[PDB]
Amino acid sequence: TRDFNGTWEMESNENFEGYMKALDIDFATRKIAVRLTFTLVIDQDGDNFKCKATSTFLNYDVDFTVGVEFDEYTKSLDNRHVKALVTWEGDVLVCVQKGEKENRGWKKWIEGDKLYLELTCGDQVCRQVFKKK
Numbered sequence: 790t791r792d793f794n795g796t797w798e799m800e801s802n803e804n805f806e807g808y809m810k811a812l813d814i815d816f817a818t819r820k821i822a823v824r825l826t827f828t829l830v831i832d833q834d835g836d837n838f839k840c841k842a843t844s845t846f847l848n849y850d851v852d853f854t855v856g857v858e859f860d861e862y863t864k865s866l867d868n869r870h871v872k873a874l875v876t877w878e879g880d881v882l883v884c885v886q887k888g889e890k891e892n893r894g895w896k897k898w899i900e901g902d903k904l905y906l907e908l909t910c911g912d913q914v915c916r917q918v919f920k921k922k
């Protein structure tokens with residue numbers, strides 16, 4: 790299924806610390822943020838996505854259309870400009886964020902009935918798993 794709609798509650802978070810370090814997030818924001826549990830609210834209609842990730846300290850909002858390149862200013866994270874593009878590889882949603890970081894982006898898929906989110910920057914990979922509320 791290609792249908793990521795819903796409210797998704799974190800059940801596991803692996804190596805968020807390495808992902809944020811590869812982004813050069815400052816120590817005190819990082820040290821707080823690696824403790825956090827996240828909730829995802831995804832609204833998906835065809836190509837049109839609206840995503841909202843929330844925690845007690847870090848929030849991240851993105852809206853995009855599959856197949857349409859867009860500019861992203863990662864204000865809530867590392868404060869960089871990237872050229873982002875989200876496309877389908879089979880049933881995996883793939884985002885590439887072109888900028889000064891290599892292999893920066895993410896991949897999302899459903900396995901069974903959970904949502905998997907893989908965050909990449911440089912040589913670091915973070916894996917998060919969510920359950921549909």
Ligand SMILES: *C/C=C/c1cc2ccc(N(CC)CC)cc2oc1=O
Pocket residue numbers: 793827829830831840841842849851866895897908
């Ligand atoms: C449905 C895909 C949108 C989406 C992708 C995300 C990428 C990165 C992040 N974080 C915080 C965990 C790092 C910047 C969150 C996120 O959530 C989403 O809903």
